[PDB]
Amino acid sequence: DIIYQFHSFEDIIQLSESLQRIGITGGTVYHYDGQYFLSLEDLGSHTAEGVVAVLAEYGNPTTLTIYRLQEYGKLIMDGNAVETIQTHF
Numbered sequence: 001d002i003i004y005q006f007h008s009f010e011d012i013i014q015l016s017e018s019l020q021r022i023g024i025t026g027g028t029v030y031h032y033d034g035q036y037f038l039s040l041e042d043l044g045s046h047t048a049e050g051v052v053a054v055l056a057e058y059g060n061p062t063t064l065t066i067y068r069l070q071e072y073g074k075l076i077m078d079g080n081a082v083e084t085i086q087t088h089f
Contacts, residue, residue, distance in 0.1 A: 002040045002052060003066060004059035009036045015058035016085040022046060022054065027081030032064070032073030038081060039066055 006012050012029060015038070019027065023044040030037040038059065043051045077084050 002043075002048065002055065003062050003064055003069065004038050004055045005062040005064070006036045006038065006059040011058045012036055012038055012081070013085050013089050015055070016082045016089070018054050018057070019051075019082045020086045022051070024051065025083045025086075026079050027077065028075070028079055029077040029081045030069040030073040031076055032069055036076070037062060037064065037069055037073065039069065041079075 006015075016027075019025070019040075024040065024042070024046070026040065026042055028039040028041075030039065038055070040051060040055075
Protein backbone atom coordinates (compact mmCIF):
# COMPACT_ATOMS: atom_id res chain seq x y z
CA ASP A 1 0.00 0.00 0.00
CA ILE A 2 3.16 2.09 -0.14
CA ILE A 3 4.12 4.47 -2.93
CA TYR A 4 6.51 7.38 -2.62
CA GLN A 5 7.31 9.97 -5.23
CA PHE A 6 10.91 11.06 -5.55
CA HIS A 7 12.58 14.32 -6.47
CA SER A 8 15.11 12.50 -8.63
CA PHE A 9 15.99 8.90 -9.47
CA GLU A 10 19.11 9.43 -7.35
CA ASP A 11 16.96 9.64 -4.21
CA ILE A 12 15.81 6.15 -5.17
CA ILE A 13 19.38 5.00 -5.67
CA GLN A 14 20.31 6.37 -2.28
CA LEU A 15 17.14 5.02 -0.69
CA SER A 16 18.07 1.64 -2.14
CA GLU A 17 21.08 1.45 0.12
CA SER A 18 18.88 1.91 3.16
CA LEU A 19 16.21 -0.51 1.91
CA GLN A 20 18.87 -3.15 1.20
CA ARG A 21 20.26 -2.44 4.66
CA ILE A 22 16.88 -3.33 6.17
CA GLY A 23 16.42 -6.46 4.08
CA ILE A 24 13.93 -4.90 1.62
CA THR A 25 15.40 -6.02 -1.70
CA GLY A 26 12.32 -5.55 -3.88
CA GLY A 27 10.37 -2.47 -4.84
CA THR A 28 8.75 -1.40 -8.06
CA VAL A 29 9.93 1.80 -9.66
CA TYR A 30 7.57 3.68 -11.95
CA HIS A 31 8.16 6.80 -14.02
CA TYR A 32 5.07 8.94 -14.34
CA ASP A 33 4.54 12.62 -15.09
CA GLY A 34 8.29 13.31 -15.08
CA GLN A 35 8.78 11.76 -11.65
CA TYR A 36 9.94 8.44 -10.29
CA PHE A 37 7.80 6.46 -7.90
CA LEU A 38 8.64 3.51 -5.76
CA SER A 39 6.04 1.02 -4.70
CA LEU A 40 6.82 -1.51 -2.02
CA GLU A 41 4.66 -4.54 -1.29
CA ASP A 42 6.81 -6.60 1.05
CA LEU A 43 8.22 -4.80 4.07
CA GLY A 44 10.28 -7.78 5.17
CA SER A 45 10.33 -8.14 8.95
CA HIS A 46 9.38 -4.49 9.16
CA THR A 47 6.25 -2.53 9.83
CA ALA A 48 4.76 0.09 7.51
CA GLU A 49 5.72 2.94 9.82
CA GLY A 50 9.28 1.63 9.83
CA VAL A 51 9.69 1.44 6.08
CA VAL A 52 7.64 4.57 5.38
CA ALA A 53 9.70 6.47 7.93
CA VAL A 54 12.80 5.61 5.91
CA LEU A 55 10.95 6.23 2.65
CA ALA A 56 10.17 9.77 3.83
CA GLU A 57 13.88 10.48 4.24
CA TYR A 58 14.27 10.04 0.49
CA GLY A 59 10.92 10.82 -1.07
CA ASN A 60 7.51 12.24 -0.40
CA PRO A 61 4.14 10.52 -0.15
CA THR A 62 2.00 10.57 -3.26
CA THR A 63 -1.77 10.39 -3.62
CA LEU A 64 -1.27 8.38 -6.79
CA THR A 65 -2.74 4.91 -7.07
CA ILE A 66 -0.69 1.92 -8.19
CA TYR A 67 -3.44 1.67 -10.79
CA ARG A 68 -2.63 5.13 -12.12
CA LEU A 69 1.02 4.13 -12.09
CA GLN A 70 0.61 0.71 -13.72
CA GLU A 71 -1.83 1.58 -16.48
CA TYR A 72 -0.48 5.05 -17.22
CA GLY A 73 3.08 5.16 -15.83
CA LYS A 74 6.33 3.69 -17.11
CA LEU A 75 7.53 0.48 -15.46
CA ILE A 76 11.22 0.88 -14.82
CA MET A 77 11.78 -1.91 -12.34
CA ASP A 78 9.26 -4.54 -11.32
CA GLY A 79 9.73 -6.10 -7.91
CA ASN A 80 13.52 -5.94 -7.94
CA ALA A 81 14.14 -2.18 -7.83
CA VAL A 82 16.45 -2.20 -4.82
CA GLU A 83 18.44 -5.21 -5.87
CA THR A 84 18.75 -3.95 -9.45
CA ILE A 85 20.04 -0.64 -8.13
CA GLN A 86 22.26 -2.06 -5.40
CA THR A 87 23.65 -4.49 -7.92
CA HIS A 88 25.11 -1.51 -9.81
CA PHE A 89 25.64 1.23 -7.22
